[PDB]
């Protein structure tokens, strides 16, 4: 299945060249279809976010909090954008200060 | 082909010529440009 291989190497190359911003490489596992490469990527991935496989009936990914469950729709092109989080910070600090 | 290579060479040098940006202002909003330590000035004395 050369498509999954090419997709994997493309995602890792994008993470190298800084296009897909590590939350964005942890997802784009819409190519799940198998639990063994995830269990094998365990020992190489570490944030406290190692994947989690419970019977791949559910593929919820760890974090320092309790960890998000995978979305039904595909890992829809989540790239990072700085002005958004900056405006969210402005709003939150204004609210807390008030 | 030989015309486009010469046509783009002149246009490219003209863009690099104007790419050198060194300006000082206070209270224009102009672009999301290269030299904006300006905004540090009007927001500073109050904060």
């Amino acid at each position: 299945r050369p498509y999954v291989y090419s997709a994997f190497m493309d995602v890792v190359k994008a993470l190298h060249n800084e296009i897909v911003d590590f939350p964005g490489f942890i997802e784009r596992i819409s190519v799940i279809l198998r639990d063994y490469p995830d269990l094998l990527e365990y020992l190489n991935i570490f944030l406290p976010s190692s994947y989690k496989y419970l019977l791949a009936n559910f593929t919820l990914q760890f974090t320092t909090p309790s960890g998000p469950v995978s979305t039904p729709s595909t890992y829809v092109a989540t790239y990072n954008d700085l002005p958004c989080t900056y405006h969210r910070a402005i709003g939150f600090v204004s609210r807390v200060r008030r | 082909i030989k015309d486009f290579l010469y046509a783009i060479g002149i246009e490219a040098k003209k863009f690099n010529n104007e790419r050198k940006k060194r300006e000082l202002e206070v209270i224009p909003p102009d672009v999301k440009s290269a030299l904006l330590p300006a905004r540090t000035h009007p927001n500073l004395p109050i904060a």
Partner: protein, 43 residues
Amino acid sequence: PSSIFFGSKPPLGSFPLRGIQSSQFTLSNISDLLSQSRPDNNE
């Protein structure tokens, strides 16, 4: 760090978490003009 991972739905009353582009049927949703026009590493 938990609310940053699959954040394509803005939660309820907040400005967007992450930005969205297209993925031209690629099975690796990166591949784009972003991919084809970014540095990997007579003319």
